[PDB]
Structures are given as structure tokens and as C-alpha cells.
Amino acid sequence: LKKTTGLVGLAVCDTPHERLTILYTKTLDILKHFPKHAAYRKYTEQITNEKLDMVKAEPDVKKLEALLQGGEVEEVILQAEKELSLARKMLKWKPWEPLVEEPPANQWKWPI
Amino acid sequence: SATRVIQKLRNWASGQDLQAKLQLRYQEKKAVTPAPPMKRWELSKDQPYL
Amino acid sequence: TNMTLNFGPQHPAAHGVLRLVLELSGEMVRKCDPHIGLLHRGTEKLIEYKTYLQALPYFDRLDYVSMMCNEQAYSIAVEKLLNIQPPPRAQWIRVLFGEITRILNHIMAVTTHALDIGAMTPFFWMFEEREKMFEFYERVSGARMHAAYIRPGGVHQDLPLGLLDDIYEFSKNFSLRIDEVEEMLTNNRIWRNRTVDIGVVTAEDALNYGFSGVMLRGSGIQWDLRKTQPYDVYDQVEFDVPIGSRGDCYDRYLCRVEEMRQSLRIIEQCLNKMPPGEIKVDDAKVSPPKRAEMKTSMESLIHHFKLYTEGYQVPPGATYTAIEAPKGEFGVYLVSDGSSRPYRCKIKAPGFAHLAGLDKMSKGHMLADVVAIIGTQDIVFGEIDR
Amino acid sequence: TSVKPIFSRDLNEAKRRVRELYRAWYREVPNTVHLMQLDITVKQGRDKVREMFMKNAHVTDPRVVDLLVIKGKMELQETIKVWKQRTHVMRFFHETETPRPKDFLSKFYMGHDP
Amino acid sequence: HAVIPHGKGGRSSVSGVVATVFGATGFLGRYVVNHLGRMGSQVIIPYRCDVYDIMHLRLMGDLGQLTFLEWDARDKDSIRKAVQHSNVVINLIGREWETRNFDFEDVFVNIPRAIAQASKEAGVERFIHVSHLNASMKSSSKSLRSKAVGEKEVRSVFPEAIIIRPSDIFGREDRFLNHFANYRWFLAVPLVSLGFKTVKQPVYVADVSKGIVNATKDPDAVGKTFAFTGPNRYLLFHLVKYIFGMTHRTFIPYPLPLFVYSWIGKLFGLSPFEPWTTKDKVERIHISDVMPTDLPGLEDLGVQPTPLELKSIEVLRRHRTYRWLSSEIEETKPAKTVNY
Amino acid sequence: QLITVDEKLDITTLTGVPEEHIKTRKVRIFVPARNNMQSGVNNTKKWKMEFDTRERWENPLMGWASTADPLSNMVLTFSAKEDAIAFAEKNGWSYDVEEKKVPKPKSKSYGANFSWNK
Amino acid sequence: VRPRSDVTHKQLSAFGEYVAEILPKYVQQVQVSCLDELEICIHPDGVIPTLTFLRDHTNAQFKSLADLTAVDVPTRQNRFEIVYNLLSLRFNSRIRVKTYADELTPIDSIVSVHIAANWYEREVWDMFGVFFFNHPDLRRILTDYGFEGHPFRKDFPLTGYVELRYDDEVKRVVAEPVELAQEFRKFDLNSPWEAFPA
Amino acid sequence: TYKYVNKKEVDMKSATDNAARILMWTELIRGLGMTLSYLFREPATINYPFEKGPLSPRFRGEHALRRYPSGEERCIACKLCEAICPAQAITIEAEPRADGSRRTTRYDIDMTKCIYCGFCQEACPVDAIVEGPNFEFSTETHEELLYNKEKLLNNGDKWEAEIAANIQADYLYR
Amino acid sequence: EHRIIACDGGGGALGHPKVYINLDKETKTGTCGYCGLQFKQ
Amino acid sequence: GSDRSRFLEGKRAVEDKNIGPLVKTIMTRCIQCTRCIRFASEIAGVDDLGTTGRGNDMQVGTYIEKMFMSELSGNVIDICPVGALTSKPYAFTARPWETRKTESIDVMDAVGSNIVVSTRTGEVMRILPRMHEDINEEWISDKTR
Amino acid sequence: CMTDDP
Ligand SMILES: NC(=O)C1=CN([C@@H]2O[C@H](COP(=O)(O)OP(=O)(O)OC[C@H]3O[C@@H](n4cnc5c(N)ncnc54)[C@H](OP(=O)(O)O)[C@@H]3O)[C@@H](O)[C@H]2O)C=CC1
Ligand code: SF4
């Protein structure tokens, strides 16, 4: 429909609503393994659920671009799978666990 | 300060009036983003495209 | 070694000093490993041993094509740490000379680009205009370049009585001079070839390698720190960022010619709307007292003596302030103890990031292509080497 | 005590790496003396390598030894690829500088602060 | 009159030796100014060559260490002002080709006398006079004999004036080593007696320089006639071939009577521009190095001589070809030493 | 897993200092006193360690002071005595710490000097 | 007085908690200082994880690395304070993540997260001596090829220990221990009187 | 507000137009016309020795030490010109002159060290050290560039008339 | 005439810090520490 | 204090006198803080310096010109925060930011008073006291400075 | 051209 996105490298993705619905539903799935009260799971699930609720709700891509911001729809696709990649990465990283170690005493005291 | 003929050769060869612009100067909880997402920039009205 | 061949430090083609150890299968470049530091001079360590006002002259030398715009970045940074802001007239001045400086940088970048390409007449055409601009610097600061005019609390001295009028005559005409270059290069049947589709950088890759400059804008990413995060009174002016598509050497060029055009729009305004007022903060604490005052009032001498001998005594803190220097985002991370002399001052140079990209830009390219790409990054080895 | 390791868990493993670097340099000395047309003797140079590799013989801590060879390996990579030139290589030999005596009487006779 | 020596020992430090050095522009000279400048000594370099040529000496001296004065040998006044404020005078005035306006006497005996003569009037603490080795007042080469004549005279103008007497010198930019190597142009390399019975002992230039400098800063040397010689002697045959060896150029030693050859020297001598060979040079070349029985020079004055083979590679490298330029001395064979 | 080392962090081998200036340089850790000229005490707060002073010969051409010691002008500032001692040990410089001496409490009262008795 | 916009101070503070909750594990201190800049301080092990979350999170996209630097507080046990300043073209904001690294305790490299860091990390090694694991090619960038010592360390003399001159005898440039003809005059500038903190 | 610098039917008229552009090099001829045009413009160069490029009063140029009309050198050795010099160029040592007044025994500006910032001009309370107009002081030897009090005082006496005029023009601004 | 006198150095901004000298004793002509000008009560 | 002055009126001037050969009293500088009159009475028993007059022409100088001759004399310099009376030998040889300060020991007398030797470019410019509670508590002799 | 007065 559009001829091309402003960003040089990005290419127009036809069936953008379908591509987003695929990525958004996947992320939601991966997040399903995160610990229940894990902060990342609750926060990202909230963001992703709102995103596809809007994607399912809006059948016009131009208004879809306005509703979840994202500039061009193609970018939103890149951001969603980038997040999908990190969600997979953090499950391995296990950031939800308690602090590695306290900073040495006086490590963060700037006046010196 | 150049004969109009020679000056003309200049304007003709150039295609615009150099006389006007001369080279000789004279006298539960909400997910929170860092800040509201930036509004995409407006197309310039005076010349959207060059 | 695939005929590894140092581009060599002495080369008219290499701005300043650049050893590009390049392995070239015949005339094709397989890998470019730029070497840097041929101009490292210690600018970051030297500053730790100097007071805030005596480190201002270092910033002009960091990237001296853009003499002042760099100062503004340190100024802003030192003003933030002190939570002082310059007076209204000084702000407009800095935007006036900030832009004049952008033109000066673009005239260098576009014309020096051509000299390496082989077009030599554009350089002489616009260096005469440059010359005329320098004279503004001199009649405002005293130095043709390396002024030291924009100081941490405003500018140093009000504009001479008459400069504005001349920064008009020039501006009124400069356009035609940009127009001419155009009739010579924008559509040359040959400029396009050597520039078009050379060093294309994707949008995602440009953000990833931290390009942050025309280089990003040329790829179509819309980011001008001057519109996104306004500094000084660049907010009160109205200009159009020249975004580009099909980012390549030719497109970005067109962008640099367009900001030369847009800066004339910003300069015009500044001349039309510069306010009556003072050009330096009134806090003798930060700005040095006027010489009539220091020669008649005791508190002013004490403030003159302490300011020149010891210093501002900035409150302890750290800040990263970035402006839109002509090359790209120029930022100073200035950590500061309560002392009058800084503790650290990493200068982010739009250029350390751009050079790094030379490798990811010039791939499968000929020797001549490498020359074109160093030009489209406006590399001034002072900022990269610092 | 209680220190996180950098490349080897113990001096033993670390020493392995030093052996490798020594070999590397040993095999390289001859080439440099030829690709840089240096006016030195391969044997002479190879002793210099030994000198340096022992100047730091005293280090007992594993972490310090690992970073030393980290530095050492970059040194030979610049030595090779002829990134360092003749002038940067010969500096190792301290050829121009006048040697200073370490004898007390010698110093007394020359410098205020020894 | 003196300058307490302060500093760590390198440039920008002080050693307290103010020294006029009249023939500094020379091959030996260059080296003498180098150490004197390195040490931090005050060096006054009299010059009559054009300023462009004297530039090479500027950089080794620290700021204000080197002062250059315009001087003419025939004009006594020029020598007078040069030594006005110096306390050490070193004389390296010498040439191989008797020039139209300067005879061997002048360059060796006449001038070097006037110089020391003034130096005394001035009150310079010590004068070092340099004359060629094996210099009999009867030696064949006019040069050597004339030089001998000088070392005597200057004594009377300046008593207790050190007289170092170096052998032909080995160093980059020297003649001894380059001359032979440059015989390449000549298809055949004549060698009197086929390069035999003229054993020669070269001495590295630096050794000579360091020695000379050490003299300036040592009370032990007064009236001493040191002889910097070398670390090994050589029959001219090995020397010639060795040279050609490092130069990697063929060698065809050819016997040619010195009688006829003195004539070849005359031929080049005839040439107006710096004759390459000199009838005297020829003779000197064949004059066999004398054995050592005089005041020890190197080592005695504090520097251990440096073998020829060690640095030969640097002196003879320029004479190699495209590939030969990459060969090194230890894969090469070092020639045998004949003490005789 | 972490490894054990009882070796005092000495990193003299990595710092890159010439041998002469690591074995012949004594640094003193001291809290700066106050120029009696001024009564402010803000420069007597942080500990500083300063390297031993070295030759300062006059320059012959201009008479400017000239120094051959690189570590002369360097004075590092450390907040506590323990941290400064640590810097000397790992860098291998010899140290001789001087205890802080702070003014003793002094009892003052305007009424006391008005005493004719004393 | 600077034109502070509290609107910012709050929004950035709120993000600072957001990040602190999202990554309880590595964030040690988060603080939106005056001047309205947010700095999340992370344990050195959190270099990879904290950056990646910021580069690839819908509610916090921090695509470009403005700078990687290392202040050196000699007093601090962990001498270096690697500071990474990141920009977000989508939320138009900037955050700084700063970690602590000692001389011989290397930090991970983020060349993976941002390739901009390929050069700055080499710059930090050359000047300060911190080492970055998994770096593609770590090697001196700014200093001379044979330079010994890391220059921006507070314990390195400004003039340095070596300087270069051309020596005729050896016909080649040659280092010599530095001998300066007018030492850097070290003016003492701190005043013995403080300023009552506002 | 943004703008697209280069963001973009086939008709014989169009094509024939485009083909002529490639075949007869029409745009290349356009470029030649521009240069021919300037060939006819007056050149902007100045005879350097005879005519000089204009420098206004604030030009920093070469250092000089001024004197009071009476003849007493202005400097009173407060030595903050030394304090604020960024390059460490100025070296000042002083002692009370027999008059009892305060004067500098030695004032040495190392011009090779100096980066002509003009802060010394700024800092001086008596304004004894000024940035003089002359920029032509190129010297054969490095030592000549180092300047002691006598050269600067002599420089001050030579250029005092213009220095006074320049300071006269710009002091209201400062 | 006055007990105390000023000394702008002559020209105000172009002179020197303004100092008031006490020409109170004919015994001594006050000398502004900046101009070395003696003032005779 | 304040960024600017409002004293558009005229200033006062006092008459420099001679307090001796060590202390230069350019007392037009005096802020009438009476620390001299105290030290000269309490730390040293000179009891000579005193206030003379009332109003804005209270000048703290000896009524008759009698030199302040006593050991412990030079301390007045160090104790007057104003530079009204300062040292006459070290009149104008230096300026404090330049002076490199090395902490050492008094050898002139056996009390071993602590002192700071202020050296510029390698020659000593002044020796002023540094505080040792037990030995010299902020004061040094006229001889050892 | 510092001063337009001869
Ligand atoms: N291997 C050797 O060369 C040996 C040399 N010696 C002796 O040591 C001395 C130094 O040798 P070297 O440096 O090779 O000699 P050079 O041929 O290099 O000449 C030495 C210097 O003397 C100057 N000079 C020559 N003639 C005159 C003249 N008529 N008036 C003024 N100056 C003059 C030259 O200056 P310019 O050219 O500018 O006129 C030159 O710089 C010589 O005197 C020589 O007798 C002894 C043994 C071996
Ligand atoms: S500031 Fe002006 S007066 Fe004070 S010293 Fe420097 S020059 Fe002399």
C-alpha cells in the first residue's frame, strides 16, 4: 500500500496486522514461563496485551500507527521481536533473582 | 565594476544575476515509559520536498 | 597480507592524519582498519589540571572547523552544573554564531569532499565566503578562529556596534553562493556517480553504531537534538531538519547543503529578533566583573581577582550535555568535584563513532570509494583523537 | 583474598599461556629483524625477549600474569603487521640513552638525588 | 670560570663545557657536536659553509646550547671572537684534497696553529688538536707529514694541548668504508699489492667522538697524544672484499702499480669538484697501519672500541640493490683478522 | 568460581612506570595543614599522598626552573588513611603515613577575660 | 536559575523505579539527580543484562550509545567507574548506567549490545587499563604504538616519562626519559573556605 | 518540521528530454557556464605586502607590556596574568624596586607556548599586558620567539600609539 | 588641597584600580602603589 | 558576601607607619579586628599595640612610633587576616597559589617548632608556622622565619 | 582597516 518506509533499510511489510499479531502472541507465550510475580512478566505482559488489543481492534494501519505510536508499522514489528528476543534472553539471565552483591562501602560516594 | 558585455557573459553563463549578490564587498501498576513517546515531525509546509 | 597498504598519514586525500591499514585485492577493499591517535594530544587529561575558564580554549581546538559550536557544549555543561543560565541576548548570540559556525563547517565539509573527489573550484568559491565569515569571528572575538567568545556564562563581550548589519549583507547573498556550488555539483553527471549508492547505511545500523548526525538524518531517521532537546534559544526559532532517504554519500551531501540553507533561515531570524540586554550572567560569582566596576568597586576587584586566579568553584556533580554540533552530537560528560578545576571531561566526538563505521560502510569498495566516504563523515581528527 | 579469575584459575594454567607467548616471540624475532631491516642480531633480540619475559618473573598472582600476556599478545600483533616501525622496535633496546651507573659512589659524584 | 654541572644527564641539562669546535660540519665533527649536545655542554660551532648546510646540527643541541659563528680561516679576527667565551677548543680542521685556496699546510698546520694560538690569548683551559694516525714528519703523503708538522707547532703556541691522533675512521658517511664500497662503479677494483701488506685498523666514528668528548671532561689528559685505533686489524684484502660482501657486489681485486696508480689519483685530483681519490689518498690508503705503542686512546679514555663488522651493515646498506638490501650481517660471513 | 591469592595486590608490573621511579620514590601520606595565613579549614580535610621532591635546576637560556622528575607535580587525593596506604602497596611505592593532627578543643568564654582577678 | 521542568524530574524518576523493579538483580542505586538526569548504577555483572533490556524493551528503547567513559577515583577500591550514557530516540530521553571496575577485574564488553562500543572500549583500555572480555579486537587506539602505561589514570604524570627527539648518531627518532625545560607550575587553587551548601 | 532532500511517466517528450541529457552532456555544459561566468568576475585577492586583510580593534596578535604616560611601566606584578594563562606561558618573578614600589624583575612570555587566548589581556587589573595588533613577528630562530620583559616593553613602546587607539575603541565594550 | 586624594591612574577604566591616598603628612608625599606618583599635600 | 557594591561614597585612608624592619604595616587595609592587639598582649607580652581614637578613624597602631621589637613578632603577619601589616622581606617576591608547600622542622632553636617551607621554582620564599599542639601551636620565632 | 582614520 505505502511505497516505502522513511527509514532506508526497513522494507514495507504487507499483512502488517497479521505479522504483528503473530509476534505479539508469541511474546505473550514466552512470558508465560517467567516466574509468576516476576516484574518483567507483569510489566511486559501489560504492554504487549494493550498492543495487540489495539492491533486486533484497528483494521486501518494508518490509525494503527497512531494508536500504539511506533512511527511506521514496520518499526513496531522490529521492536516487538527485539523484545521477544530479550524476553528469551532474560529467562536465561534470570534478572528477577536477588541482588548479585552489595556495592563496596563508599563506592557510590561522589564528593571525594 | 565590469563592462556590461563582460558582465552579461557572466549572467548568461551563470543563469542568474550575480550583480545583485557580488563577490566584491563595497561600502496492577501502570507500565511507565521514560517520557511520552515523541510526536512524529510535521511535513514542512514551505517545501515538503526539494 | 592481501597487499596491505597504509593509506598513509601524509596524503592530501586523508584529512589531517589517518593511517587506514587497508588490505586490497587489486582495486577492491576487503577490510579497512582505521588507525587513530595520530593527533591525540591529551586534551582530556590536560583539562583536569586547568580551571574551568582556562579549559574553555581547549574546546575550540577539539574540532576547530566548528570552533564555537563546541564551546557552547562546554558552556551549557558548566552552566548546568552551576544551575546558572545565560542572559537572553547571549543566548541569541550563541545561536547566531552557532549557526554561522554550522555554515562554516558545511562549506568545509562539502568543498573539501569535492577536492578529494577532484572538483577544486567549489573550494575556492566558498572559502572566499568562509573568509568573510571568519571576519565576523574576528570582529566579535578577536581571533579569526579559536575565538574563546562563548564562555561558560554567556558570551564574553557584546557584538561590536555594527556587526549585525554585516552578518546581514552576507546572509542576504550567501544563498546565491550555495546555489552556484549546486549548479556545479548537485546534478553533475559525474558527482552523482562517485557519490550515489556509495556507503549506504541502514537506519537500524546507523542508530546501532552510534552515528548520531547527518549520517543518521541521511538514512531517514528524524533526529535533530536542536528540535528534540532544545538548547539555548534554538527553540524560539523555526527551521526544517533536512531528512534524507536512500541514504548514501549523495543524499547526505544534499542534507548538508540543505542545513546550510536552513541555517540562513535561523540566522535571519536571530538578526531580526535579538533582544536588548546584557551578554553575561550578572552573578560576579560565575561571570567576571566589568572592568569599570573592578576598577571602582572593592567587591568587584575581589570577585575579579578570585575568578581569574582560582575559579568558578562549580558545585559537585556530573552532567552529559549534548548539542548538535555541525558534525553531529557533541557532548561533554563533565564530572566535577566542588573544586574550581574539573575532575573528568570526556568529550563525545561525533566522529569517533563515524570513523568506526568506515568499516561497515566501505565494504567491497574501490580505493576511490574510501576517499569519498571519509569525506561524507566530516572527520576532523581533532575531535576523534582528543 | 577471594578474587575472581581473569583467564586462568591458577598460576599453573597461566604459566601455560606465558610459554605460548614466549614461543610466539621467539619465532617472530627473526622476522622482525628482517622486515624492519633492524640493525640487530636475531640472537641478540631473542635475549631481549627473554629479558622482558623475566623482568616480570617475580609476579606470583594468577590474575596479574593473565593481563600481562593480554598486553604481551597485542604487543607482538603490532610488532607483526609492521604497525610498530623500526623506531618503535629499537626503543626496546634503549640504544641512544646513556646508561646510568647504580654504584653509590657513582651517583654521589653526579646526582643530588639518587 | 666554570659551570657547576646540574641535571639528570640528558638534553635540557647542564655539563659546563663551553667549547668552540671550528670544523664541526665534518663527518667526525657531526658526531663531536652530538655527544657534546647530548651531555648538555655549551657548543660554539664556527662555520664558513652556507646556513642551509649547517641546519643538520641544530636539532641535536638543546635550546640555546648551540651557537653558530661566521668565521674565515685567513681572517685572524674571526677565530679571535669564537674563542672569546669558550673554555675548551677542539680543532678538527682537515681535508684530503688540497684546494685552490687552501694547502695541506693550511688545513692541517697553518690554520690549526693560529686557532690554538688565539685560544691561549683567550685563556681556554684546554685545546684538543686532531692529527691523522702514523703521521711522520717524513711520511710519504704530504698530508700526513704536514699534519705531523702541525702537532709540533701547536705545542709551542699551546703547551699541554691534548693531541688525539685517530686512524682512518669507520662510520656512516666515512670515506674509508664508503670509498671502497663505491668502487662498484669501477668494474675492477684496483688494489695496490693486490690489497696486501697494508694492514689497517679502523675505528668507529662514535668511539672516536666519545673519546674526544671524554677528553674535554677529564684532567688525566694533558699533553697526551692518544691514539684511538680499533678493536681488530685487517689486511686491506679482507676489508675490501668484506665491504663488497655486505654490499653484495662482486669483487675483482686487480694489482696495479702504486706508481701508475698515484697517477690515477692525480687524475681525479685534477677534477675541480671534490676529487674522489687523491694522489695522497692513494698513498695513505696503502700506508700500512702502524702498530700501537702510544698513549692508549679508546678504553684508556673510557670507551670500549666497537668492532667493524658490528655496525658495518648500517654504513654499507645504501650500496646494496633491490633485494640485497634485506640481508643481515650474521647470515653473512665475517672476514678474518690479520694482526701482523 | 573465585580463586584464592594471598599476594598483596601489587600491580607494579602493569602500571607501566619506569623501574627507577618505583624503587627510588618515597611518597608521604599526610593531611595538608593550613596556611597560617587563612583561618579556613576546608583544605585540611582530605588525606593526600605526595611523592618525594627531586632536582629543580635553573635553565641556562631563560632562567626558568627545570625538573627531570615526572612524579613531582602529582599529588593524589585519598579520602581515608586506609585507602591511601592501599594505593602505595599495590603500586609498590614506599610510604610513611603521618597521623592527622587536629586542633585540640579549647575552652573559651567572653566572661573569663573580664576577670580582674585573672 | 536554570528552567527546571519538574514534569521531567518525575517521569524519569518513575522510569528509574521501573528499571529497578524489572532488574532487581543488578541495579544497586538509581537516582534522578538535579539537572534532571537519571543514572542507574549496576553491579559489573549486570553490564550485559541491563544494557540489553534498555536497548530492546518496548517501554524503554535506548538504541544508541552516546558514550562509554571511565572516571578514576583512586580512593575507591574499585578504581574505575565505567559510565555508559545512552539515548532514546523514541522517548527522547537519556539514561546513564555506571558500573565499577578495579584494575585487574575486567568488565564484560557490550560490543554485542551496541557496536558503537567497539572503539570506546578500546579507548578505555588504552587510557585507563580496564579490560573488556569478549571484545572483538582490543588494542590501543589513541596512544603511541610502543606506549607503556595507561595515561588518563590519575596516578600517571601529565608530562609522562618518555619524550621523542631525532638523534643524528643513530639517524632515527629516539625516546629518552622526559626532561622538561619549565616544569608544569602546579598552582594550588583550592580555597580554605567552603561554601555553605545551599 | 522536517524536509525530504531527495525523496522520489515515461513519455517520448520526457524520455527524448532525458536521452538528450545523457547523449549531448547537457548538464555538463551547464557546469562549464558557471566557471566561465566567474572568469569574468573581479578576483578577490589582495596584494599582500601592499594591501592588508582588515583586522578590527580586538585582534589579539602579538603580546606587549604598556607603560603609564609618565613612563612608569604599568605592570605591578600581581602575577594573576601568570595564574590565568592556559598554557603556562608567562613566567613572572618580582622584588620590591628600590623605589619601594612593586615591579617584575623577570617577565617572560614564551610565545611558542602561548596560544594567543587573550585572557591575559582580560585578567590584568592595570591592563599592563595587552594583545597588540601586530601579527607579523615570524622569527628565524626558536630563541627569538621566547620574549623577556625588555622585548615586550620595547614591543609596547613601538606599538603604544595603536594599542592605545585599539583599547580606546573597545573598552566600553569590556 | 584635600587630606585624601584618589588616583584613577588617569582615565578611569583605562587607568588603574581607584585608590585613595592619604596625603596627610607633608613629611611624606603619598605614592599610589600603582603609578608611583608622589602627591604633595 | 555580595556580588556588588553600593558604596558610592568616598573611602578613608590611614597613614602608614613603621612597626619595625620585619612587618610592613600598610594599615589602610586594617578591618579593626583587634587580633593583633590581643596577640601582642596575650600570646606575647608586648602590650604595645593598641587602638587609638573612636569612629571610622580608630587606627590600631602604636600611638608614638616605637617599633614592635619582640620575638614572636612575625606572627602578627600570620594572624592579621587582612594584608594590612605583612612581611617586609617577603614583600612582593611571590603570590601564594604558586608556592609549593613542604612540611618540615625548625632547626634554629631546640623547641623543634613545626614549620612549612614555601618553595617556588626551587628557592625557599617563606617559612610560616604549621600547627603542632605540643611543640609550636601555630607560632614560630622571629629568627626561624 | 583597524581605524578608518588616516
Ligand atoms: N677518517 C677520517 O676522516 C680521519 C680524519 N682525521 C682528521 O680528523 C679531522 C676531522 O675529519 P673529517 O671530519 O673527516 O674531515 P672533513 O673532511 O669532514 O673536514 C672537517 C671540517 O673541516 C672544515 N674545513 C676544511 N677545510 C677548511 C678550511 N680551509 N677552512 C676552514 N674550515 C675547513 C670543513 O668544513 P667545510 O666543509 O664546511 O669547509 C669540515 O667541516 C680531519 O682534520 C682529519 O685530518 C684523522 C684520521 C682519520
Ligand atoms: S596582570 Fe597585568 S599587571 Fe598583574 S602582573 Fe600580569 S601583567 Fe603585570
Ligand code: SF4
Ligand atoms: S589584626 Fe591585622 S587587621 Fe585585625 S587589627 Fe591588627 S592589623 Fe588591623
Ligand SMILES: [Zn+2]
Ligand atoms: Zn595611581
